[PDB]
Symmetry: D2
Subunit: 289 residues, 4 copies
């Protein structure tokens, strides 16, 4: 169980300086893992990353969100093939890094669709995801589909939909990824989805309802962490937060970050690392006696 | 018999129908009273072709009050930098205010300060100035007709202007119009706000309209919204404006609104049970909170 | 799944009039069932009750809390036998009434112990409770041990303790009774006790944190009812509230009811009926579509 | 090392550490309280006559730690008794406790000081209440001249029959009208009696001068039913900057009288070093987090 921080706490540009900065600041805030947003994995400086991770003795993972030009839920096979080629490059980036986990909105575009998912689009997604999963299987990489809210996909809005999606592909390294931010909008409660997906849950995002400081919003973290403890979850737990103060050219506009929710990210990250770790410590004590 | 007091318990029309032709108006007015509500809220996405006579007739027959909400779009975006786009929306808003006056309604609300969509760029100072100026004109027009206007705070995916009650407060202070007020929504508050009582307390004076929605917009009490704290806080400020249920499912589709609001999922089929559940939920909540000042 | 009301919403005296009064009002507020507090089962008017239940078509159950003089968790076997004979008469009363459910603090005194439990006292309790369960069994009655808080017993304060207690007795009609008012104090959360006790959960009390109006205190009813949804619970669900305005000379003092929490019980009972039936109506829709 | 300067002291109650406050327990508890990160230790002055003040003074200076004391009366000392002998025994127990604090150079005295801390079997009587009010009014006056604040702790129905809610406590103060007399709320007891976790804070605003952070069952924080989020948010909205003191009880750490009085029947923790550090970190992190809310 590694405790991680999403790279957009620190920078929005993952050039050499941004890779080095984020890795270092992640280590300084107390985390074990940095999660690299590979929005563009074709231009991600793997050498700078492997060097920075080794220096700070830190682990890496990667998340990603596709767009209109790379939508695998598209009925246009050229667009589905673009996304599958991007997803495959990211898996390659993770293999080069020696990392084990790939996750995110890799089953559709990460946007506000204006129509429902189509049956054919869903097949294209499932086929695509299955091929990525198989390719990732030979390289030692787990793939987790992130359930996100109605405004960021029209495909996987609940843990149950994710479970049905997986059940068709029945790939041994393909898992579900839950984000407390997204749960707090779409799910019926913060404990049933964790119980429901028990075996399939392989990646977790910790995010406040407005995506700022932990425990300054509407997200029921207590119920969540107690559920996680009950199914014996031992995957990554990764802080995630977005503010006007750290902008990415792509991601910040896709996630609708219009507001300043922090300025001092070194305080935000240290606090969050403390928040998650002490949540896990308290829950262990329900477990025993 | 019409309920004459100010705190009316209302239903959003989209529990009942997506189409507000004459049958849709009649179906929703009837089903709304059959559920126990005092008021129906009409989604005037198009107020130019809204059958005002049918609405008058059905409201009188069933003895029901009405209000109207609305969300703009790209062609009607008042936060657009182009005075032609701005003035298209401004004509849209004006017709809605007129439709309400004909109905004898009091309350106009919704996302009327920008398009109701997923923006890709933060707001501009120029568009912000356009929204304020136009909203200031619509409020003026409404004031002569005995209509209040309430700006609905909604989540980051539905506007890039007013995402918190604090932003709305600041927006009103600039315009300083006596009939312009704030409209909060528990669904939206559950995303953007810090907690469910601070928005109520900060907004106290300006809170004129409230929407009751579960976190996923389904059945009340099957999601993650903290209704207890919200209602307790409403009772602490002695709120007595409208309180209106709001729910969307793929069962009942609007060609426009269902797609703008991202209703991909089926959350209920039986809307008679939904509306009846929600009426009791709101009214029993209000009944319980009243007992707290005594114990 | 009958939805019940505790008798002290209506009266503190279960003489002929009290019995008739409590049965009438329970039905007028909309309940299916009235739970009689059998503080003194020897003097309970069974005939008036059977009369009143049939007149208003209402089901019945009974609850009870032992006192110092009847403490089956005593080391004094004369006290233990007084307690056993009182429990036995209560079981008898339920048989005559034609009821199925007996519940309450029947494994110890209901009081503020000034000493931890003794091993000798714990063994007295289990053996007495076992005999009452055996007796009850031949009359088709379930016996449900109510988990209460640290101030009302020193024996069974959590569902986990109740399960371990049951494990040693292995009686087929012995179950656990949970009260939200008590869980809100002693339990780690409102779902995990339900899931842990699912087999043996046979009776439920619905009470606010201060025992007044439902939804005017600190109890997490949402998580509670959703957990009951998860395990398929369909035993009795009974409203329980206490106020200065309805006094039971014994029970009001034992429970520490010092405050006015309601003056008009007719509104209170109607509200609590709607509240519970509406929680259940909504939870049913979570399960499927 | 160095004494925390300001008023908002993050403290720890002594029964996290030990149940006996002879010289050894005082030293043990002060050292561990500083070790876990706290600014303050609250001594349970159940018996203030036999309290070793000079040892206390030593340990507090050595470890750079502030102090306060809490206390709960009993049958023999019930200042809400109608027997004036019993009220006097209480008033003289309270007075010595006042005195120990002044010797320590403390500022805060709190606890269940308006009655016995027990499960009463009868409602409060008008005569007892009269005794309680006048007697507390005197202990407050006496404490006033010494620079001591006196905070009445609101506790649940099973531990008193006088002050079970914030509103009751207000009406008690309004009748005494004493400047140094204040209210002490406890999230554990609030979780039972109050209407919610923010109204008692908003209602008590002025007179709120002491705060106990205890979980619903009184073990680790964040492993129970207490709504800490709303509570700390409400603290932030009123600008509260008094003490904030952790409080936990487990059968691993037993005081002869107190642990029985409070019904500590269960084992809720054993490694109290980790508990205190966890609790300290919990409170400071909560207060950090909530200070961000005004800005956003
Ligand atoms: O929470 C998320 C978006 O709503 C996901 O983690 C994103 O896919 C991630 O930020 C991409 O790097
Ligand atoms: O909640 C809303 C949309 O998110 C607003 O109330 C809309 O304006 C409404 O649904 C349209 O009538
Ligand atoms: O909750 C209870 C006592 O605290 C139980 O319901 C009692 O056994 C009941 O009130 C007595 O009939
Ligand atoms: O919370 C308390 C009891 O529940 C009070 O603080 C006690 O009186 C305290 O432990 C006595 O020192
Ligand atoms: Mg995420
Ligand atoms: Mg709304
Ligand atoms: Mg009970
Ligand atoms: Mg305390
Ligand atoms: Na929430
Ligand atoms: Na609670």
């Amino acid at each position: 169980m590694k405790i991680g921080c999403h790279g957009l706490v620190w920078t929005g540009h993952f050039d050499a300086e941004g890779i080095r900065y984020s890795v270092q600041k992640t280590r300084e805030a107390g985390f074990d893992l940095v999660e690299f947003p590979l929005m563009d994995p074709f231009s991600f400086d793997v050498q700078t990353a492997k060097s920075a991770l080794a220096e700070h003795g830190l682990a890496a993972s990667a998340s990603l969100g596709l767009s209109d030009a790379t939508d695998v839920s598209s009925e246009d096979p050229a667009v589905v093939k673009a996304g599958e080629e991007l997803l495959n490059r990211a898996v390659d980036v993770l293999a080069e890094l020696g990392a084990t986990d790939f996750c995110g909105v890799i089953y559709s575009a990460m946007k506000k669709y204006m129509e429902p998912a189509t049956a054919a689009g869903l097949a294209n997604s499932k086929a695509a995801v299955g091929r990525v999963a198989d390719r990732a299987s030979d390289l030692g990489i787990n793939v987790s589909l992130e359930v996100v809210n109605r405004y960021e996909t029209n495909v996987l809005n609940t843990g149950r939909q994710a479970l049905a999606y997986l059940e068709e592909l029945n790939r041994p390294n393909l898992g579900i990824h839950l984000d407390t931010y997204h749960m707090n909008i779409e799910e019926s409660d913060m404990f049933s989805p964790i119980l429901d997906t028990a075996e399939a849950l392989r990646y977790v995002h910790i995010g406040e309802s407005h995506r700022g400081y932990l425990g300054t919003g509407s997200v029921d973290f207590d119920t969540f962490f107690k559920a996680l403890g009950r199914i014996g979850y031992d995957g990554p737990v990764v802080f995630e937060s977005f503010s006007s103060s750290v902008v990415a050219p792509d991601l910040s506009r896709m996630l609708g970050i219009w507001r300043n929710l922090w300025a001092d990210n070194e305080e935000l990250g240290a606090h969050a690392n403390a928040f998650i770790r002490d949540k896990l410590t308290a829950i262990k004590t329900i477990e025993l006696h």
